[PDB]
C-alpha cells in the first residue's frame, strides 16, 4: 500500500529539475494520484513556482530534518487537491553544515517520510544543484532517481559524475535505489549539440532514457511567475503535453 | 600595482555564472590584462570551457583550500597568454564537507589567493550555484562581487536572498567587499518576462546594473564543447560582442 518516492537530481545548475518536479507532480495530481512535492533546495523554487514561500523556517522541511517535527505538520495545500507541498527555506544552507556533525546525517529525510509512505501515491523530491548532504538525503530516501538532462554541453559533461555518485549511493547508503530514467530537457532542434546529446545518451543508456523529450518552450518559464504549474497555465502547450506524457509513463510502471 | 579579485556569484543554477567567468576573463586577457580564473565549483565548468578538466585533486584549488599548497603552483596555461586557470575537481563536494570542521574555514581561499593580486590585474572566481562554504570562501576572498542575473522569473526571485547573504559576508567576514555590478544575462527580447526583469532590476539598482545585456545566443552555448571562449570560437557573434563590451566597461 506504499507509494513511490522519486528524487529529481542533477548537480548541474539550471537543467530543469524544478520545472520537472513541479510539472510532473501536478500531472500526477491531475490524474488523482495523491502526490507530495518536497522541496530540498535552499532556493525554494518548487514551492515558489506553486505560490508557496515561507518567511522563516516554520512550516518548512528544515523542521523535519533538524528539529524532529513530523512532516504531517508541514503539508501545504496547492491549487490541486491531490498535490501538497513541503517547502524549503534558505536556512537549508546552514542545515547542510549542521548535519555534517550529527548522527544519521544522510537519513533525516528518509526517516521523516516514513509516517507518510502509505498516505501518498507519489512523493517527488526536488534537489538543489549539488551533491551535498541535502541531495544525498534525497537519494537515500528515494525509491528511484529521475535525472533531467539539459540538451547542452555542460550538462552532458556532468552526467558521468552524477551516475558515479548514484553508484556510490547504491554501494551503501541506499542499495535499492533505481534509475527511474533520464529525461532529456530544454531540447532545441536548432542547436546541433542538442541532437548530439540525444544520440549519445540514447546510444549509451538506451531504455533508461525516457521516450518523451521536453522541448524548450517559453510557456514553461512563464508559469512559475504566476505560481502555476503548466497544466493550470497553458494546457495546450507542447511543454505541458511533454509532462503529461511523462506522468503517463510513470503511472504505467505502477499498474 | 595591485589587481582586483572579482567573485561571480548567484545561487540560482544555470544563470550564466561560468559563461560570464570564462568570457569576461578571456576578454580581459585579450586586452593584455593579466587574468587568473579560479574555479570554485565542483562541476568544474570554467576549466572545462577552456580545455582543462580532471577528476583528481592534484593541481586543483582543492589543494589550496585544504592542503596548504600555494596557488602559485596551481596555475594552468590556456590558449591566451594572459589567461591562466586554477581548476576545480569534483572532489570539491567532499572538500566542502571537510571544510565544516576546519579552523577558519571561511578564509581558506582569501589567505591563499589575495597575495596573487600582486601578479595579476584581474582574478575572477567562478562560484557554484550555492551559498555554502565554497561560495562563502569566494565572497570572503574577493574585492567585489559580480552578479549574473538571468532574465527569467526564478533568477529574479533569488536576487534578494543573494544580496542579503552578500551583506552578511560584508558585515562579518569581508567588510571591504563591494558590488562590481549586476549583469543581465540570457536575455530573450521576444520573452515578455525578460523585459520585466530588466526593467525591475534597472529600476531598483540603477547604475550598479551594467549597460551591456548578454543576449541568448546559440554560439555561446556551443563554444565550451570545443574548449574555447567565444572570442576564439565566433568573434562575429553578438555573444562575443557582449562580453568584449563588458570587459571594456570594467576596464574603465
Ligand atoms: N523546457 C523549458 N523551456 C523553457 N524554459 C525552461 C524549460 N525548463 C526550464 N526552463 C527555465 O529555465 C530555468 C532553469 O530551469 P529550472 O529552474 O527548472 O532548473 P533547475 O535544474 O531546477 O535549476 P537549479 O539548479 O537552480 O535548481 C528556469 O528559469 C525555468 O523556468
Ligand atoms: N547567453 C547565453 N546564451 C545561450 N546559452 C547560454 C548563455 N549563457 C549560458 N548559456 C548556456 O546555458 C547553460 C547554463 O549556463 P552556465 O553553465 O554558464 O550557468 P552557471 O550559472 O554557470 O551554471 P551553474 O549554476 O551550473 O554553475 C550552459 O549550457 C551555457 O552554455
Ligand atoms: Mg531547481
Ligand atoms: Mg557554472
Author numbering:
A (entry chain A): 20 to 274
B (entry chain B): 20 to 271
What wording appears in the published article?
However, X-ray analysis revealed that all crystals lacked the peptide and only contained the ParA21-274-D60A•ATP dimer. The structure of the dimeric complex, solved to a resolution of 1.6 Å, was highly similar to that of the H. pylori ParA·ATP dimer35 (RMSD of 0.767 Å for 225 paired Cα atoms), in line with the high functional conservation of the ParABS system among bacteria. The structure of the ParA21-274 dimer in these high-confidence models is similar to the crystal structure of the ParA21-274-D60A•ATP dimer complex (RMSD of 0.527 Å for 242 paired Cα atoms), supporting the general validity of the modeling approach. When associated with ATP, two monomers interact face-to-face, with the nucleotides sandwiched in between the two subunits. In the case of ParA, ATP-bound homodimers have non-specific DNA-binding activity, mediated by clusters of positively charged residues that line the edge of the subunit interface. A combination of computational modeling, nuclear magnetic resonance (NMR) spectroscopy and mutational studies reveals that ParB interacts with a conserved hydrophobic pocket at the edge of the ParA dimer interface that is formed by residues from both subunits and includes a loop immediately adjacent to the deviant Walker A motif of ParA. The fact that the ParB-binding pocket is constituted by amino acids from both ParA subunits explains why the association of ParB can only occur upon ParA dimerization. The ParA dimer contains two ParB-binding sites located face-to-face on opposite sides of the dimer interface. However, there was a noticeable increase in HDX in a region at the catalytic site of ParA comprising the Walker B motif and an adjacent loop that reaches up to the ParB-binding site and contains the essential ParB-interacting residues L150 and L152.
DNA segregation by bacterial ParABS systems is mediated by transient tethering interactions between nucleoid-bound dimers of the ATPase ParA and centromere (parS)-associated complexes of the clamp-forming CTPase ParB. The lifetime of these interactions is limited by the ParB-dependent activation of ParA ATPase activity. We demonstrate that the N-terminal ParA-binding motif of ParB associates with a conserved bipartite binding pocket at the ParA dimer interface, in a manner dependent on ParB clamp closure. Moreover, we show that ParB and non-specific DNA interact cooperatively with ParA and synergistically induce structural changes in its Walker A and Walker B motifs that correlate with the activation of ParA ATPase activity.
